[PDB]
């Protein structure tokens, strides 16, 4: 019972390992013990690569006879099946953090180890798990991607000055937590109101991420997440930086721009709701295309109409001790909002320090 | 002896912060004697005009002072210096010496054979009188300047609606923060616009301040206006409280008020009150610490003026948009190097707020 869970939290420990590179897969560990020493290690690190069992049951050999699997997801039943790649090496018992966020095929991997003659079990540390995808869980449950708003300002809730000068507000620590967070999340979204008033590059710059991630993240594998931008009137150029990066950039059209752009640009069609883009189905349209997190950088306009619409998952809110004024430019537009009543209302479930800033994380209460 | 010592200091800071509701204008000071390796006595300073900590603690020693070991978190001063002798002490520790008489007391125990030292947990004392402290030092109350705002950092809509951005969990706070404070400072503005009476009120703070704090025993602290247009009436409420009002204005009012309202004048600088040279006659006046409840106006020009010694910020997790007011006007304010620059020193949680605090450096 004290068992189950040392050897469990090893694999969570493991399956965090490719929590950078494992998009759309989600981050799974396995663990191999026979006679209380590991002898099978194993974590999913890339979409059509081994899966954390066979990485695992490789290591393990014939020593997986009779072995106890510690999963922190229920391993695949559809097809080669990891279900099947444990029979074949013989594991008499099996540890499963959870079932698998499908409901269509929500304990179907337990059920078949199970009619084989296997021990199973799952439920250990299943909160743990579930916040290991917290992205990819929210899009098999519901068809949304976990939507994360970033917000850095002043004391005062103050993001640029009067002037414009927005760089510096944060600390250097402040914005390097936000390459991590950056490198973990599956897509980064932006507006076109970003885009044009920033001409930003809003990749994952490998060299601005601490000594402890870099350990963990080689450089030649670094994934850049797919960049969204919205543009409902097609305002961005073909000559702004976003799309003259390394990686994908995925531009949300109301209509189809008549300009040739690089090649790694797309584009994706979303009906329009009054006059604007249909923030709602392109959150759709994106769970389809199997998108489990998106980060989003946005300035004031683009994050009050996610907020008005719903949509926030998570504020993640870096705030700095200096105080900017009054008529430095403000944290979100809320364009209708005039009584105290109307105001979004949230819920701090995280406070850390980030250097001198502190980082308030919210959900949407 | 060495963490034997810290045990009984952190008694004596224990003690001493029991009477940070009361002390003013004198400082918390607390004193623990030990006899034997046992407390035979044990004292903290309560009231202005009330006996010291020594006294305190000498009394319920009596006899049993003689060759003991006294802790005190301030150096010794009728004076305490004398009568820590004429009961007879061997050994004195001593958390701080005097901002100001620094060594003298210290001096004066050593001519009459007392082995003396100090230095022992001299930051957490610094903590226990930041005001006073800096009065003696500087000739300035320490200022803390208090911020309720949302998460945008808005203190009230377009309309003025601003009830309830904060939970009642900081309002109560707030109370303690006001309670341990030597004087409350606002605006005429404010005044006008809320009518408040910016009071301690006992039934709104919390079973643990309220236990140590019995309502006969209530000071409430002392209200400062600054009115340099003389705009406020004598029918606000703020001058109707029990207690004394400060008016810091720039011309003698001609009417008449009530016997608990007094005047201060400061000298105007350019078109404005000099905000510094209150400060300076405040503390002349022997106030050691102001809590600061003001608009963004006054809250900027403190800010502008350098006094502000601490931020205490109130964050909601709620979103009030950009046309909701602002927490601070900073005119001039066009670079970030010239904008006000603090450090997060403790951050809590106040039910579902959060209250940050922040120093100027
Ligand atoms: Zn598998
Ligand atoms: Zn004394």
């Given at each position: 019972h004290m068992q189950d869970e040392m050897y469990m939290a090893?694999?969570?420990?493991?399956?965090?390992?490719?929590?950078?590179?494992?998009?759309?897969?989600?981050?799974?560990?396995?663990?191999?013990?026979?006679?209380?020493?590991?002898?099978?290690?194993?974590?999913?690190?890339?979409?059509?690569?081994?899966?954390?069992?066979?990485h695992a049951l490789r290591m393990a050999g014939d020593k997986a006879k009779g072995a106890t699997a510690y999963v922190t997801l229920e391993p695949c039943s559809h097809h080669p099946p990891c279900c099947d790649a444990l029979i074949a090496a013989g594991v008499a018992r099996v540890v499963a953090a959870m079932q698998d966020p499908n409901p269509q095929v929500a304990g179907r991997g337990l059920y078949r180890?199970?009619?084989?003659?296997?021990?199973?079990?799952?439920?250990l540390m299943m909160n743990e798990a579930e916040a290991l995808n917290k992205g990819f869980l929210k899009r098999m449950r519901t068809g949304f991607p976990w939507i994360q708003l970033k917000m850095g300002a002043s004391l005062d809730g103050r993001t640029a000055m009067a002037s414009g000068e927005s760089q510096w507000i944060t600390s250097p620590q402040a914005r390097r937590d936000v390459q991590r967070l950056r490198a973990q999340?599956?897509?980064?979204?932006?507006?076109?109101?970003?885009?044009?008033?920033?001409?930003?590059?809003?990749?994952?710059?490998?060299q601005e991420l601490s000594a402890d991630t870099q350990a963990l993240y080689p450089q030649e594998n670094l994934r850049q997440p797919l960049r969204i931008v919205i543009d409902s009137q097609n305002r961005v150029t073909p000559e702004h930086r976003i799309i003259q990066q390394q990686g994908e950039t995925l531009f949300a059209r109301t209509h189809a721009d008549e300009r040739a752009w690089p090649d790694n640009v797309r584009t994706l069609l979303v009906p329009e709701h009054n006059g604007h883009l249909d923030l709602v189905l392109l959150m759709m349209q994106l769970g389809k295309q199997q998108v489990n997190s998106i980060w989003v950088e946005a300035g004031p306009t683009l994050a009050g109409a996610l907020l008005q619409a719903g949509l926030v998952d998570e504020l993640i809110v870096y705030?700095?001790?200096?105080?900017?004024?009054?008529?430095?430019?403000?944290?979100?537009?809320?364009?209708?909002?005039?009584?105290?009543?109307?105001?979004?209302?949230?819920?701090?479930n995280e406070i850390r320090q980030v250097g001198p800033d502190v980082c308030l994380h919210l959900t949407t209460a």
């Open positions: 090893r694999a969570l420990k493991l399956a965090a390992r490719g929590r950078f590179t494992t998009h759309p897969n989600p981050n799974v560990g396995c663990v191999i013990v026979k006679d209380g020493e590991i002898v099978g290690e194993g974590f999913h690190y890339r979409a059509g690569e081994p899966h954390a069992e066979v180890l199970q009619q084989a003659g296997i021990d199973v079990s799952h439920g999340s599956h897509a980064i979204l932006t507006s076109s109101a970003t885009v044009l008033a920033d001409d930003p590059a809003l990749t994952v710059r490998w705030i700095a001790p200096k105080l900017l004024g009054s008529d430095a430019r403000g944290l979100c537009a809320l364009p209708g909002l005039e009584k105290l009543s109307q105001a979004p209302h949230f819920k701090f």
